[PDB]
Structures are given as structure tokens and as C-alpha cells.
């Protein structure tokens, strides 16, 4: 889930009019646009101008040369003079810097004009303001990508000799602290800490353990397994074994290994039918249930394969997969299978339903609401929002607004990313 910059260089030829080339420039050795580069940059493109109609030049481009003359290490005025004296036919060599987001369906995007040192200074200022300036802290952190937050944390520690997460742990409280500390962890660190929390102490928070283990992919689970061992000095599988038993343990342990078959380009029609018939013969068709058979099929096959298996299953069975689970099993095991099949069939709708359940009644299941808003904000929140609005008739934004208040509400609404 990582951002990228695509730096490319392009030659652009324009015809000067009475209005000129139609853009403004900034920079120079005497007017350094940032701390380092003395380069010349396009700061604005005038509408209905030469550069605009041509469409190639972008705001933010660096001008490398004008008619073959380089704009490297020039005073601002010397660069202006190259433009003023370039004639009516002007050849530009420019450098484009294009920001690429990690996911197309995330709600939180990388910030364009990002300066980790400035953000760290501003957050320290907000922490040290009398009474704590939570608004500024929320405004910054919910409007930076997770990778940018890691860079802020690094600059903060260097400046203050304190870890940013610890400083905010001390400065904040309540649900807002929970949101902010969650946003500061990497995705694997966050999931690992949420898994540990679901198991630490007497009993188990099966709801949270199931949500994470059933919804994460092989790539996410492999990194969680690695980070969990670094953070807690034990294997995630050993903690699952410690906290669970019976068939529920078998299913959780199997899923947590992250060894599901990857999506392939070959559709295995013969296996689709055999899997569907096996699911029927293991469950609705017989007395009792062959749970190991269900576990093997539903944990080992790829997600696109299982989507087709569940459709073929309806050719054999009078009930669909979800209804069959309800009839065959119970307890933690039923809850796990139901969550898993929902994640296979439509994962954004799965999270939309969990979000609705966390708010629909008296109060709020804040732990679930926060974890989904934090963990899915850079993955598929736009699809979650679309499923939510389609099913429930009002936006996710609307439900968050009614159920939460204060700076905590503000933070969740930023992670939502907008109204629908």
C-alpha cells in the first residue's frame, strides 16, 4: 500500500500570443521554492492561454531549459529574461512529477506538498499549546498517508528526543487517542496490535479476531505474522492456539497461515464443480457436518475460485452458502464461517455491514468503528462507502456524524473522506 512518484521529462513547443505563453514561474537561486532546489517551477497556468490549450504543461512542472538554454542555478530574473527574449516559437523541456496513490479506492490520499519537518514542528506546537490543540493534530494526521505519517514520526523524534506516538499518547485521551495512535502504526503493526488485544487476558474477543483473520489477504497476513513475532516475541499461531479450541481453532489457525492459493488466469471448471459438490455432501446433504472438508476448501482455494464455487453450490443445494452455514454449525465456528464467506463474496459490503452494526443501536461499538475506519481508509473505503449508501440509503458520513461527537467525530469524518 505504497505511494510512488513518476518523474518524466518532456519537450513542449508553444506559440507566444499577446497574452504570452500563459503561465507563471517561481524559483531561482535567490528565491528557492523549497529549501534545496533552486529550480524554476510552473506555479499557475492561465485559463484560455497558450500553455492551457496545448494541455501538456502542468502546474508543478520544473522548467529544465528554454530553447536549449538550461535553467539550472539561475537567478529568478535571469530565468525570466530567457522567457522574455525567447521569441514567439518557444521550445520547453520540462520535468513532470506525478504522484501515484497506493490504492485507487482509498479515501485517504498522500498529501501533495508534503514536508515532514514542518508537520512535526506544527504537531509539537499543537501538543504544547495550553490545553492541547487537538484540531491541528487531527487536521494534519488524518490528511496524510500512512507512509507520510511514518516520516513525520521520524522527524518528530529527531527534533524532540521523544517518540511521536508516546507524545500523543500523553497528550490525548478517549476515543480520539485510540484513532490517532492507530493511524500512527504501519498497517501490519496495527493489525498485529489489534490481534494481540483480542486475545490478551481471560477470554477472547472472537468478533475482532474473526474480522481480522477472515478479511486479510496472504500478503497482509505474511507481514502480520512477521511483525507480530517482532513485537511480542511469540508466533501469532501460538497465541491463537492458546486462546481457541476445537474446530474454531482449526479454522483460525488455517486462515492465519496466509497460504491461500493465489488468483490464477486459468479457471478450473472441473475443480469448481467438485468443490461445490463436496461442500454440499459435507453439510446439507448428510447428518451432521464434515467440518474439516469445509475448512480445507474455504481456506485453500483462491477467492475468485470460491466465488464461482459458491455459485455452483446453489445448483446442488436448496440453500446458498450462508444459509447452509447457519443450518449446519453454531457458536464461534458459525460466526467465523459466516464472516469468511461474506469476505469472499463482497468484502466492501462486509465492512459496510460491520460499520452499520457498530452504530445502528444505542451508543457505539467504537472499537469496531475505529478499526475499520483506520485499516480500510487506504484500501477500499470508497467501495465500502458505495455499498453502504446503496444498502442503507444514507451515507457512511451521515451515520458517523449522528453517532460520534467532538474532535473524535472530525477525525472519523476525515478518514471517511467525504459524503455520498
Amino acid at each position: 500500500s505504497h505511494m510512488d512518484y513518476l518523474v518524466t521529462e518532456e519537450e513542449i513547443n508553444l506559440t507566444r500570443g499577446p497574452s504570452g505563453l500563459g503561465f507563471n514561474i517561481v524559483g531561482g537561486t535567490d528565491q528557492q521554492y523549497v529549501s534545496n532546489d533552486s529550480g524554476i517551477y510552473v506555479s499557475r497556468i492561465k485559463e484560455n492561454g497558450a500553455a492551457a490549450l496545448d494541455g501538456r504543461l502542468q502546474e508543478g512542472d520544473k522548467i529544465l531549459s528554454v530553447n536549449g538554454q538550461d535553467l539550472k542555478n539561475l537567478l529568478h530574473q535571469d530565468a525570466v529574461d530567457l522567457f522574455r527574449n525567447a521569441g514567439y516559437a518557444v521550445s520547453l523541456r520540462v520535468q513532470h512529477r506525478l504522484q501515484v496513490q497506493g490504492s485507487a479506492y482509498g479515501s485517504v490520499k498522500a498529501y501533495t506538498n508534503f514536508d515532514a519537518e514542518r508537520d512535526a514542528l506544527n504537531i509539537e506546537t499543537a501538543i504544547k499549546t495550553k490545553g492541547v490543540d487537538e484540531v491541528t493534530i487531527v487536521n494534519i494526521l488524518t490528511n496524510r498517508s500512512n507512509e507520510q505519517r511514518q516520516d513525520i514520526a521520524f522527524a518528530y523524534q529527531r527534533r524532540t528526543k521523544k517518540e511521536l506516538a508516546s507524545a500523543l499518547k500523553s497528550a490525548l485521551s478517549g476515543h480520539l487517542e485510540t484513532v490517532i495512535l492507530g493511524l500512527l502504526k504501519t498497517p501490519a503493526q496495527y493489525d498485529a496490535s489489534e490481534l494481540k488485544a483480542s486475545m490478551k487476558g481471560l477470554g477472547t474477543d472472537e468478533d475482532s479476531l474473526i474480522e481480522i483473520i477472515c478479511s486479510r489477504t496472504n500478503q497482509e497476513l505474511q507481514e502480520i505474522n512477521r511483525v507480530y513475532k517482532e513485537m511480542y516475541k511469540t508466533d501469532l499461531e501460538k497465541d491463537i492456539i492458546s486462546d481457541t479450541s476445537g474446530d474454531f481453532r482449526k479454522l483460525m489457525v488455517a486462515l492465519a497461515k496466509g497460504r491461500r492459493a493465489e488468483d490464477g488466469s486459468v479457471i478450473d471448471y472441473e475443480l469448481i464443480d467438485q468443490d461445490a459438490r463436496d461442500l454440499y455432501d459435507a453439510g446439507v446433504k448428510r447428518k451432521g457436518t464434515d467440518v474439516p472438508k469445509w475448512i480445507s476448501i474455504m481456506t485453500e482455494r483462491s477467492v475468485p475460485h470460491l466465488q464461482k464455487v459458491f455459485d455452483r453450490y446453489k445448483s446442488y443445494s436448496p440453500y446458498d452458502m450462508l444459509e447452509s452455514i447457519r443450518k449446519e454449525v453454531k457458536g464461534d465456528l458459525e460466526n467465523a464461517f459466516l464472516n469468511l464467506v461474506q469476505c469472499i463474496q463482497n468484502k466492501p459490503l462486509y465492512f459496510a455491514d460491520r460499520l452499520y452494526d457498530s452504530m445502528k443501536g444505542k451508543g457505539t461499538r467504537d472499537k469496531v468503528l475505529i478499526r475499520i475506519m483506520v485499516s480500510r481508509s487506504e484500501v477500499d473505503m470508497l467501495k465500502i462507502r458505495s455499498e453502504f449508501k446503496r444498502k442503507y440509503g444514507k451515507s457512511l458520513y451521515y451515520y458517523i456524524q449522528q453517532d460520534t461527537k467532538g474532535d473524535y467525530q472530525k477525525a472519523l469524518l476525515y478518514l471517511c473522506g467525504g459524503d455520498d
Binding site: 507563471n24 514561474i25 506555479s43
Partner: peptide
């Protein structure tokens, strides 16, 4: 911060 029209 000088911004110059060209």
C-alpha cells in the same frame, strides 16, 4: 516568493 508571468 516572486511569481512572474511569462
Amino acid at each position: 516568493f516572486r511569481e512572474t508571468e511569462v
